[PDB]
Amino acid sequence: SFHVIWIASFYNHSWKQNLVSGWLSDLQTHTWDSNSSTIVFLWPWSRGNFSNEWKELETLFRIRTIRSFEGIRRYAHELQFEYPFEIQVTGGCESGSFLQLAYQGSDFVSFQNNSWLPYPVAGNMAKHFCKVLNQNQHENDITHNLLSDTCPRFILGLLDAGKAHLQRQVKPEAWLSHGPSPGPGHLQLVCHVSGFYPKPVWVMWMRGEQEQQGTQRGDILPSADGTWYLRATLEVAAGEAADLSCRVKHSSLEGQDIVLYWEGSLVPRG
Amino acid sequence: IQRTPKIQVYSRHPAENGKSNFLNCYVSGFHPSDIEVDLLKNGERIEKVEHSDLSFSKDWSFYLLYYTEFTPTEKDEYACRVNHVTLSQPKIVKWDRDMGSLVP
Numbered sequence: 309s310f311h312v313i314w315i316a317s318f319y320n321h322s323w324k325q326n327l328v329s330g331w332l333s334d335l336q337t338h339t340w341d342s343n344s345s346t347i348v349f350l351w352p353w354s355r356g357n358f359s360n361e362w363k364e365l366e367t368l369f370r371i372r373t374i375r376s377f378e379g380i381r382r383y384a385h386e387l388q389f390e391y392p393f394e395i396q397v398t399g400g401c402e403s404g405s406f407l408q409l410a411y412q413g414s415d416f417v418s419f420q421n422n423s424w425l426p427y428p429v430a431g432n433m434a435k436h437f438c439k440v441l442n443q444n445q446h447e448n449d450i451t452h453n454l455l456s457d458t459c460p461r462f463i464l465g466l467l468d469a470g471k472a473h474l475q476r477q478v479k480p481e482a483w484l485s486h487g488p489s490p491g492p493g494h495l496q497l498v499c500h501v502s503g504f505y506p507k508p509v510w511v512m513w514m515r516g517e518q519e520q521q522g523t524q525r526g527d528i529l530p531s532a533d534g535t536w537y538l539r540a541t542l543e544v545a546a547g548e549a550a551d552l553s554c555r556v557k558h559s560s561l562e563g564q565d566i567v568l569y570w571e572g573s574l575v576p577r578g
Numbered sequence: 579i580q581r582t583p584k585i586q587v588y589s590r591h592p593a594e595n596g597k598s599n600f601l602n603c604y605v606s607g608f609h610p611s612d613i614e615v616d617l618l619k620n621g622e623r624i625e626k627v628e629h630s631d632l633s634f635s636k637d638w639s640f641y642l643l644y645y646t647e648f649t650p651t652e653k654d655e656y657a658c659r660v661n662h663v664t665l666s667q668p669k670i671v672k673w674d675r676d677m678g679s680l681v682p
């Protein structure tokens with residue numbers, strides 16, 4: 309499940325920014341250097357089984373980005389592109405393959421079997437954009453082979469080389485805190501869970517063996533070390549905060565759940 | 579169209595005075611991508627803050643993780659300051675930590 313994202317911001321006809329990066333499953337593996345004009349390898353297993361093929365992959369991406377920026381600048385007025393605008397592209401694969409492009413953060417065009425098809429909502433301006441993108445059919449055949457053929461060879465060199473990374477088990481740590489206290493006479497009990505990997509996790513406030521269905525599970529947030537973070541909050545009346553506990557289940561614990569108790573200075577005791 | 583950023587602040591480890599930690603500010607769901615995010619210590623901007631590479635979600639909204647290594651003390655107060663074209667004024671989201679029971 310490797311995919312590449314592409315961010316191009318056109319501030320005016322003579323100023324821009326370009327950000328490119330590659331992703332294995334959810335782990336960033338590559339980054340493009342605009343100045344160096346070369347692929348940087350975030351990890352040692354990012355090179356795959358390819359040795360040196362990388363020079364062609366660089367100059368191929370270098371050419372196709374040179375054509376893209378100049379083509380967008382040339383046809384901007386014809387496509388009703390008004391500065392400042394941003395174009396986002398994501399292309400990848402998995403049994404599956406995709407290549408989608410957005411204009412101003414909305415679905416604009418997508419690459420189906422062998423050509424660029426407009427999203428019917430994007431109107432005539434997307435149809436005109438597909439006319440420019442479908443000018444050269446050999447270029448679209450190259451794009452077809454990159455998604456259907458070149459990518460599966462990329463996953464072969466990446467997934468096997470870095471399988472120990474995606475399948476590693478990192479145990480979480482957890483702690484309790486008071487929340488911003490919604491509503492008079494009530495408390496917000498917060499259960500933090502950080503440092504776990506992989507992403508699937510189970511966390512609930514408990515009264516003994518009874519799961520507390522008021523548990524509000526937040527978003528799973530990234531940590532710069534590659535692990536994940538999550539807050540689970542429970543709102544209770546000040547009196548009925550007794551015998552409450554947070555229970556964390558994770559694949560790394562092998563059934564040894566983390567159990568923390570709303571106790572001590574949290575209550576606070578006497 | 580334009581989308582206002584969601585701002586979420588968290589530490590890597592539980593707050594313990596004198597122990598090094600990592601303060602995080604995850605900014606997501608915004609559009610366009612131009613944004614300024616600062617980590618604050620006692621209202622003062624923290625220098626040399628790292629952030630991840632700009633990325634976007636399935637709905638094309640962008641997201642960024644800002645983080646820095648820090649050591650909290652008892653008096654310190656940390657927060658995240660974000661400004662964006664969707665905001666009338668810079669929005670400040672605090673790092674919520676407990677300081678134990680109040681009365682001794």
Ligand SMILES: CC(C)=CCC/C(C)=C/CC/C(C)=C/CO
Nearest residue numbers: 312314372397399400454458459
């Ligand atoms: C990485 C491989 C082999 C396929 C992913 C598809 C890809 C290279 C997308 C590039 C995104 C893009 C807009 C490039 C500049 O035209």
